[PDB]
Structure 1
Amino acid sequence: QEINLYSSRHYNTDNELYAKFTAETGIKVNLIEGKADELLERIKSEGANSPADVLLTVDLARLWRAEEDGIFQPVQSEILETNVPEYLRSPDGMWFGFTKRARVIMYNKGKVKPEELSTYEELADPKWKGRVIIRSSSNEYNQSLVASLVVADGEESTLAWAKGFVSNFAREPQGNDTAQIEAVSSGEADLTLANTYYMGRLLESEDPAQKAIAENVGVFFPNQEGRGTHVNVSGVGVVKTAPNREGAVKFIEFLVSEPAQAFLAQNNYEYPVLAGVPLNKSVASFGEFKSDTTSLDKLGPALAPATKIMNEAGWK
């Protein structure tokens, strides 16, 4: 028994995660990693005999586009239904989220006080001129965030926001989320937007250098007075032509079960989807916050206008 996993997850803990699965079920995991868009293209180009059993992403919107293109097959699992909140899985059992991550404002403690922060929209304020940095618009975390702004504020307003946000950049987008945190820590900028688990990793690192970086940067959950902080998920679905549907289903059921949920929360610093599972202490220290649960099912359709907006605004 084996499954062919196509995953856009890119963490050093993924190997142990999959190992946990095999040690529990005896099912071998053949892994193919790459960026979400690349994996979807590969699957579609490989045809009806593609080896792909499971498609794993770190973005809800890409999962939507995958389901739209009919790449998944329905799965009805009692464990999936009970463990995964309805709003975090496909109404037709096409895909399911198994972790949650928040894209929040991370700021230099010495240069910024929390009282000066509020919403994502405010980051376009002239006050932040030459003090903001963020990774490239090509990244899905950013595209999904911009999509949520389109959904909540509209295309016209988001375009205006993006132009202002870009005008505030201290440097052109370079590096990943962690590179942004380090740059803010080093005084190259005062704030950025990154996923919570990246800060969790730095705070929990055995490398003193990483922990030192974390100490200079604080975390702020935006839009608390309104829709809430933008929350995305790491999701998964069984490919329609999966050669081993049985193993594929067991894999997804494994991901949402207590053992895997606890590991993901404790070792990869993400928010588990299963209730009753404790967060990593460092992540717990961020505090409680309101999550945006209303803009989720409309994010996918908003991808197109979001990317158009990011391009027009000059967000490289």
Structure 2
Amino acid sequence: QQEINLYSSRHYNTDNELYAKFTAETGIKVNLIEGKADELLERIKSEGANSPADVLLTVDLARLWRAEEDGIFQPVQSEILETNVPEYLRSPDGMWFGFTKRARVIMYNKGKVKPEELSTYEELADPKWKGRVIIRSSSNEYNQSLVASLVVADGEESTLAWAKGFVSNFAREPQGNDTAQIEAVSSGEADLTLANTYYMGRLLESEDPAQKAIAENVGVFFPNQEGRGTHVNVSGVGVVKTAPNREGAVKFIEFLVSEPAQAFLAQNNYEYPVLAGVPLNKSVASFGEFKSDTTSLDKLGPALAPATKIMNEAGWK
């Protein structure tokens, strides 16, 4: 009918094609405003009631929770959203909804580690992994959310003990992003790390043989399968309280979690769809099926604070 103003901190070269499909089926133009997560959040708060923002699209529970607490979102009730998105992947009060799922798993050098040697996140604190593990900085959202999940499942005391052991096992000081960790593991600089599955998908699906060769030496292991499951996080979306086009905003979110959009995202961005039954990208499917921790993501929100305090006390740079 009219248009919506999308504030997104997620920039993918394929997003334009995705948004074009939404416009084709609804007749609603999408105005894209990009920027850093913290930048967009602050911009909305300052623009006030005159803010044109209809939808806020960001990544990781850490970002979504912060916006939810700041009262940036408005509750949304939709049969399609409640049916397509598992309850644990969306705000219990309908403030935000995940539309992609990413898993933070163990990636190991196939030449130095056997899957039989792996089991849970907690076991990585064991001295047998001393000097054999690497991971990015504790200031990264992915790691914060991961530690928050341990706080919730294991408690603060137990998580602090784990963190101290885990950090003492580091082969080197945290440096580089997830992809850097994967490269170092592939080369043999370290035996294992923790990274998001889609990064491996990008390498395996690369048109460059050299980049693909990097992934070929790294195995993917989903931890805690006999227990609570693998830690998962999401890319999420929510309708801004002051949205000038609430109706269009809701339609956009329903679009993102529908078959067409879900299949596109899984196939082109190598992430897991939230909608059950949607086919995965070939390479991602090759990792195998796994059990996801179904703990309500919103529950990890309040555990983010103690998680950061634990990482600092453990000496996780």
Report the alpha carbon displacement of residue 40 of structure 1 after superposing the two structures with TM: 2.2
- Mark the CA change 1:10 to 1:184 in structure 2 (over 3 Å): closer, same or farther: farther
CA deviation digits over 1:47-93, x for unaligned, max 9?
22223211112212432232222111122223212211222222322
Distance (Å, rounded) in 1 between the aligned partners of 2:11 and 2:108? 25
Contact 1:152 1:295 in 2 (8 A): no
Contact 1:62 1:300 in 2 (8 A): no
CA deviation digits over 1:10-64, x for unaligned, max 9?
4333333223323333333333334433332332233222232111122124322
- Mark the CA change 1:128 to 1:34 in structure 2 (over 3 Å): closer, same or farther: farther
Calculate the TM-score normalised by the size of structure 1: 0.94
Contact 1:148 1:295 in 2 (8 A): no
**RMSD, aligned CA:** 1.7
SS in 2 for 1:287: coil
CA deviation digits over 1:149-191, x for unaligned, max 9?
0001111121121122122222222222112111111112111
Could you tell me which runs of 5 or more consecutive residues in structure 1 were left unpaired when the two chains were aligned: none
Report the alpha carbon displacement of residue 125 of structure 1 after superposing the two structures with TM: 1.6
Distance (Å, rounded) in 2 between the aligned partners of 1:172 and 1:44? 37
Moved over 4 A (4+): none
Report the alpha carbon displacement of residue 102 of structure 1 after superposing the two structures with TM: 0.7
- Mark the CA change 1:79 to 1:198 in structure 2 (over 3 Å): closer, same or farther: same
Contact 2:105 2:221 in 1 (8 A): yes
- Mark the CA change 1:259 to 1:109 in structure 2 (over 3 Å): closer, same or farther: same
Contact 2:88 2:296 in 1 (8 A): no
Distance (Å, rounded) in 1 between the aligned partners of 2:147 and 2:66? 16
Calculate the TM-score normalised by the size of structure 2: 0.94
Report the alpha carbon displacement of residue 295 of structure 1 after superposing the two structures with TM: 5.2
Distance (Å, rounded) in 2 between the aligned partners of 1:122 and 1:260? 38
- Mark the CA change 1:4 to 1:173 in structure 2 (over 3 Å): closer, same or farther: farther
Contact 2:92 2:298 in 1 (8 A): no
SS in 1 for 2:167: helix
- Mark the CA change 1:159 to 1:116 in structure 2 (over 3 Å): closer, same or farther: same
Larger mean Cα displacement after TM superposition, 87-96 or 246-255: 87-96
Distance (Å, rounded) in 1 between the aligned partners of 2:288 and 2:154? 27
Distance (Å, rounded) in 2 between the aligned partners of 1:117 and 1:35? 36
Distance (Å, rounded) in 2 between the aligned partners of 1:92 and 1:266? 30
Equivalent pairs, count: 316
Identity across matched positions, percent: 100
SS in 2 for 1:123: helix
Distance (Å, rounded) in 2 between the aligned partners of 1:295 and 1:243? 30
Distance (Å, rounded) in 2 between the aligned partners of 1:165 and 1:22? 48
Q: Residue 269 of structure 1 aligns with which residue?
A: 270
Distance (Å, rounded) in 2 between the aligned partners of 1:255 and 1:261? 7
Q: Residue 235 of structure 2 aligns with which residue?
A: 234
Larger mean Cα displacement after TM superposition, 228-237 or 75-84: 75-84
Could you tell me which runs of 5 or more consecutive residues in structure 2 were left unpaired when the two chains were aligned: none
- Mark the CA change 1:2 to 1:172 in structure 2 (over 3 Å): closer, same or farther: farther
- Mark the CA change 1:13 to 1:314 in structure 2 (over 3 Å): closer, same or farther: farther
Q: Residue 130 of structure 2 aligns with which residue?
A: 129
Distance (Å, rounded) in 1 between the aligned partners of 2:179 and 2:20? 26
Larger mean Cα displacement after TM superposition, 92-101 or 256-265: 92-101
